[PDB]
Design an enzyme around this catalytic site. Sequence first.
Site, PDB file in Angstrom:
ATOM      1  N   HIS A  78      38.031  43.278  43.685  1.00  0.00           N
ATOM      2  CA  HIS A  78      39.204  43.123  42.814  1.00  0.00           C
ATOM      3  C   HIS A  78      40.458  42.873  43.621  1.00  0.00           C
ATOM      4  O   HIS A  78      41.360  43.712  43.686  1.00  0.00           O
ATOM      5  CB  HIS A  78      39.342  44.335  41.904  1.00  0.00           C
ATOM      6  CG  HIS A  78      38.271  44.442  40.865  1.00  0.00           C
ATOM      7  ND1 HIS A  78      37.304  45.413  40.938  1.00  0.00           N
ATOM      8  CD2 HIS A  78      38.088  43.727  39.732  1.00  0.00           C
ATOM      9  CE1 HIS A  78      36.544  45.249  39.870  1.00  0.00           C
ATOM     10  NE2 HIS A  78      36.975  44.242  39.118  1.00  0.00           N
ATOM     11  N   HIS A  82      39.681  37.099  43.953  1.00  0.00           N
ATOM     12  CA  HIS A  82      39.250  37.222  42.561  1.00  0.00           C
ATOM     13  C   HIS A  82      40.324  36.647  41.592  1.00  0.00           C
ATOM     14  O   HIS A  82      40.018  35.845  40.696  1.00  0.00           O
ATOM     15  CB  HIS A  82      38.951  38.688  42.212  1.00  0.00           C
ATOM     16  CG  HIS A  82      38.623  38.892  40.768  1.00  0.00           C
ATOM     17  ND1 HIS A  82      37.574  38.221  40.164  1.00  0.00           N
ATOM     18  CD2 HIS A  82      39.207  39.701  39.858  1.00  0.00           C
ATOM     19  CE1 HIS A  82      37.548  38.648  38.910  1.00  0.00           C
ATOM     20  NE2 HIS A  82      38.521  39.526  38.674  1.00  0.00           N
ATOM     21  N   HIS A 116      45.991  39.568  36.288  1.00  0.00           N
ATOM     22  CA  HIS A 116      45.094  40.422  35.514  1.00  0.00           C
ATOM     23  C   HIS A 116      44.522  41.674  36.173  1.00  0.00           C
ATOM     24  O   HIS A 116      44.185  42.596  35.445  1.00  0.00           O
ATOM     25  CB  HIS A 116      44.015  39.619  34.765  1.00  0.00           C
ATOM     26  CG  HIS A 116      42.799  39.386  35.593  1.00  0.00           C
ATOM     27  ND1 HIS A 116      42.786  38.463  36.606  1.00  0.00           N
ATOM     28  CD2 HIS A 116      41.606  40.025  35.566  1.00  0.00           C
ATOM     29  CE1 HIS A 116      41.587  38.544  37.146  1.00  0.00           C
ATOM     30  NE2 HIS A 116      40.843  39.465  36.551  1.00  0.00           N
ATOM     31  N   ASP A 117      44.388  41.698  37.503  1.00  0.00           N
ATOM     32  CA  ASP A 117      43.881  42.878  38.229  1.00  0.00           C
ATOM     33  C   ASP A 117      44.903  43.332  39.307  1.00  0.00           C
ATOM     34  O   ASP A 117      44.516  43.943  40.305  1.00  0.00           O
ATOM     35  CB  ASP A 117      42.512  42.559  38.873  1.00  0.00           C
ATOM     36  CG  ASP A 117      41.312  42.686  37.952  1.00  0.00           C
ATOM     37  OD1 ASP A 117      41.333  43.579  37.058  1.00  0.00           O
ATOM     38  OD2 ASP A 117      40.306  41.976  38.194  1.00  0.00           O
ATOM     39  N   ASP A 227      37.147  36.014  33.817  1.00  0.00           N
ATOM     40  CA  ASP A 227      36.931  37.229  34.603  1.00  0.00           C
ATOM     41  C   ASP A 227      35.517  37.283  35.177  1.00  0.00           C
ATOM     42  O   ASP A 227      35.332  37.769  36.289  1.00  0.00           O
ATOM     43  CB  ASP A 227      37.169  38.470  33.730  1.00  0.00           C
ATOM     44  CG  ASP A 227      37.525  39.718  34.512  1.00  0.00           C
ATOM     45  OD1 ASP A 227      37.895  39.586  35.680  1.00  0.00           O
ATOM     46  OD2 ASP A 227      37.519  40.823  33.911  1.00  0.00           O
ATOM     47  N   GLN A 279      21.446  43.480  37.294  1.00  0.00           N
ATOM     48  CA  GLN A 279      22.076  42.163  37.123  1.00  0.00           C
ATOM     49  C   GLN A 279      21.447  41.342  35.980  1.00  0.00           C
ATOM     50  O   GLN A 279      22.180  40.762  35.169  1.00  0.00           O
ATOM     51  CB  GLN A 279      22.117  41.411  38.454  1.00  0.00           C
ATOM     52  CG  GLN A 279      23.164  41.994  39.440  1.00  0.00           C
ATOM     53  CD  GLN A 279      24.585  41.767  38.961  1.00  0.00           C
ATOM     54  OE1 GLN A 279      25.088  40.629  38.925  1.00  0.00           O
ATOM     55  NE2 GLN A 279      25.250  42.840  38.537  1.00  0.00           N
TER      56      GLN A 279
HETATM   57  C1  LIG Z   1      25.467  45.716  36.030  1.00  0.00           C
HETATM   58  O1  LIG Z   1      26.325  44.673  36.534  1.00  0.00           O
HETATM   59  C2  LIG Z   1      27.677  44.767  36.266  1.00  0.00           C
HETATM   60  C3  LIG Z   1      28.272  45.927  35.598  1.00  0.00           C
HETATM   61  C4  LIG Z   1      29.681  45.910  35.312  1.00  0.00           C
HETATM   62  F1  LIG Z   1      30.263  46.923  34.668  1.00  0.00           F
HETATM   63  C5  LIG Z   1      30.524  44.840  35.660  1.00  0.00           C
HETATM   64  C6  LIG Z   1      30.023  43.706  36.285  1.00  0.00           C
HETATM   65  C7  LIG Z   1      28.553  43.636  36.604  1.00  0.00           C
HETATM   66  N1  LIG Z   1      27.972  42.490  37.225  1.00  0.00           N
HETATM   67  C8  LIG Z   1      28.719  41.429  37.481  1.00  0.00           C
HETATM   68  C9  LIG Z   1      28.047  40.294  38.085  1.00  0.00           C
HETATM   69  C10 LIG Z   1      30.187  41.383  37.198  1.00  0.00           C
HETATM   70  C11 LIG Z   1      31.185  40.418  37.340  1.00  0.00           C
HETATM   71  C12 LIG Z   1      31.152  38.990  37.817  1.00  0.00           C
HETATM   72  N2  LIG Z   1      32.353  40.992  36.850  1.00  0.00           N
HETATM   73  C13 LIG Z   1      32.118  42.197  36.469  1.00  0.00           C
HETATM   74  C14 LIG Z   1      33.217  43.007  35.970  1.00  0.00           C
HETATM   75  C15 LIG Z   1      33.930  42.646  34.745  1.00  0.00           C
HETATM   76  C16 LIG Z   1      34.996  43.533  34.375  1.00  0.00           C
HETATM   77  N3  LIG Z   1      35.355  44.685  35.130  1.00  0.00           N
HETATM   78  C17 LIG Z   1      34.699  44.990  36.323  1.00  0.00           C
HETATM   79  C18 LIG Z   1      33.591  44.188  36.801  1.00  0.00           C
HETATM   80  C19 LIG Z   1      32.954  44.627  38.117  1.00  0.00           C
HETATM   81  N4  LIG Z   1      30.836  42.548  36.606  1.00  0.00           N
HETATM   82 MG   LIG Z   2      40.202  44.082  35.580  1.00  0.00          MG
HETATM   83 ZN   LIG Z   3      39.094  40.841  36.932  1.00  0.00          ZN
END
Ligand SMILES: COc1cc(F)cc2c1nc(C)c1c(C)nc(-c3ccncc3C)n12
Ligand SMILES: [Mg+2]
Ligand SMILES: [Zn+2]
Length: 322
Positions: A78, A82, A116-117, A227, A279
């Site tokens: 983050h 990103h 956004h982050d 996102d 995943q």
């Molecule tokens: C179990 O696999 C996951 C659980 C999770 F909760 C968030 C995940 C995530 N796998 C991916 C690939 C991913 C990507 C691109 N982006 C996010 C995301 C979106 C919003 N907030 C935080 C994250 C990390 N994730």
């Molecule tokens: Mg965020």
């Molecule tokens: Zn984000």
Amino acid sequence: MSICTSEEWQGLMQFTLPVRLCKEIELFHFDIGPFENMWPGIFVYMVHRSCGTSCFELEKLCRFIMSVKKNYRRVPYHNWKHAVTVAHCMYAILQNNHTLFTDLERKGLLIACLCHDLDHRGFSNSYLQKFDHPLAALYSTSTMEQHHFSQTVSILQLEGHNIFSTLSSSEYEQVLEIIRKAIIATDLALYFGNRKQLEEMYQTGSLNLNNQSHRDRVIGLMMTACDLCSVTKLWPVTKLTANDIYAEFWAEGDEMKKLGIQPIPMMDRDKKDEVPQGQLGFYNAVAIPCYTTLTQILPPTEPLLKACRDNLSQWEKVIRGE
Ligand SMILES: COc1cc(F)cc2c1nc(C)c1c(C)nc(-c3ccncc3C)n12
Ligand SMILES: [Mg+2]
Ligand SMILES: [Zn+2]
Ligand SMILES: [Cl-]
């Protein structure tokens, strides 16, 4: 708030993007990865192409971008990389659906994506809303997202950083509201309900972009899609990004452990074997439905769904041992 130096923004002002990149930046699949030094310039370019060279005062825009970069932490995922990846995906969606969105929305969304982050610490909302960190007391729900919006406003409030000051009083409050709702939408907790409502509106034929509540929801889904966009890159890029996502997750589990609390498998570094299955679960329940609904509402966004489908296929191969 961390402020950029004179040399940083002036350097960005002087910056010119190479010719070969102009064509590639238009494509959904474009990976910013190999051009780190060019990231601020790539954003300036996308804003100028979508909004116009005179939409913002150059100096204010360059001070704004350079201070936004300085307010992203050196965390594994983050981070500034990103932020730019998310902004690029928004640019590709906006370019392919240009006239569906107003000049104010396009400006607002590209800025919301970059911000956004802001000031993310690598910790989830759940972590904060349990061991009641000051942030969770201030913001009961969508904790980090309210903080990211608060940081966006504080950067705009820095001397010569207010890029929206030239808008009318009505348009200025509209742009902030577009930004606020867009940043809040990036709280994954809200996505599930948002996609369901959108699925229903589209299916029954109720969906209406002239209806502000419908419009707010579509923007929200666009925010999730941008996102999540690492799931739409080429497999080697997607795989390497997934390692950064989990580096943060495991570090959260480590801090939890130090504080005497057991973390979930996803955040447990001693459970790396379960990652491919997690995943696949993520793509099937979150990513594939997100891009499927987005493609239904905005057909020119289909390449994002196709790229996500290819990566689901790559996770399936990992599972079977191929
Ligand atoms: C179990 O696999 C996951 C659980 C999770 F909760 C968030 C995940 C995530 N796998 C991916 C690939 C991913 C990507 C691109 N982006 C996010 C995301 C979106 C919003 N907030 C935080 C994250 C990390 N994730
Ligand atoms: Mg965020
Ligand atoms: Zn984000
Ligand atoms: Cl800060």
